[PDB]
Nucleic acid binder design. Sequence first.
DNA 1: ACTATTAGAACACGTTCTAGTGGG
DNA 2: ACTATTAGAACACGTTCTAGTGGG
Lengths: 182, 182
Amino acid sequence: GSEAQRERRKRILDATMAIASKGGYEAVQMRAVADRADVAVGTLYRYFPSKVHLLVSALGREFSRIDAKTDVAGATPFQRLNFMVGKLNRAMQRNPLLTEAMTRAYVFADASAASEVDQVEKLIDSMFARAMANGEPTEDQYHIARVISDVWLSNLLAWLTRRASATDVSKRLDLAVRLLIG
Amino acid sequence: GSEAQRERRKRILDATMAIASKGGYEAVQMRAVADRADVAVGTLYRYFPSKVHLLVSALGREFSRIDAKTDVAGATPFQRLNFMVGKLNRAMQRNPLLTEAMTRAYVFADASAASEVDQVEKLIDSMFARAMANGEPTEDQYHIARVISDVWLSNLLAWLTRRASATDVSKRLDLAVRLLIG
DNA sequence: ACTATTAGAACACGTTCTAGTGGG
DNA sequence: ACTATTAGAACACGTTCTAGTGGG
């Protein structure tokens, strides 16, 4: 049934977030996800043809949910963008290893998951973009939002690998947005 | 001997670049690298404790060599930065699958290779930074160079996965540098 | 006595395959 | 007749281990 099929898609991704929150990218093992979901490994692959597609699908729905709750505080597009980069940078650091697994999956994917990846990318831009205009944004506002998305993925990626501290990431984010709004 | 040891380090990485140029990240197989280098898999791991450390070491020495040849054309720091982002963006597209293997390795590494990764990152910044000042750069010039490094890794990463075309990558690069120099 | 190296078995996990079973 | 699902064997490759060998 399609209702049960949807139910085990949600059970598979919910399992993925549970395991990733506990042990990161190295703990999201396909057999363990298919266990905690009570599905066969063959089923788990039927729903997600790879590990990468799995975790970037879970990132897809995480950012989808966060955008849903996000759809404000700021009289300047500068302070609004700072508010979104602070909201998301703050949240992704709440579950460091869940963030690690999903972000590394998103960043190491190849063309096979391009679609999924692209979707996530778009969403993030939209958020930052909708932060700046407080609505339907400009072309230049989607541009800046795009570059900022890059800078945040780069910095978040550095913090996932102990290459940067929370203070370093905050510095480079505030500085990126400050130079992109001259 | 240390001379022979160095010789097989160079043979291992040269093998890595050869195989990656032919078949990308999925073709850089440890057994195949240890074959083409005439070393044991146990030796290959003695020199590089993982696949990731291997290919990001090869990226380390690729960017080291490119920086060595780079160490100009432009009366404006804008046109100089455009010249470096064009030089590197142009070169990395000469061997698309070698670029794919090394860039994905650099982007999917964890803390174990952080050092190596960090080194590469620094080098790239330096290049862009030295492009702008035409020498010892400012703090703000290293800043902009840093953000541009992010934007280029992001875009190059999108082009490696058929998510963006060469024209798209060129657009977003020129636009990033144009908004970072207002 | 030392430590690097080698060929290969061995192990882990991502992915696929096989045969059998259950649900619409 | 259909197609999803299941448990598990099977295969590939990254990584480690074992025993034996070579070089300073």
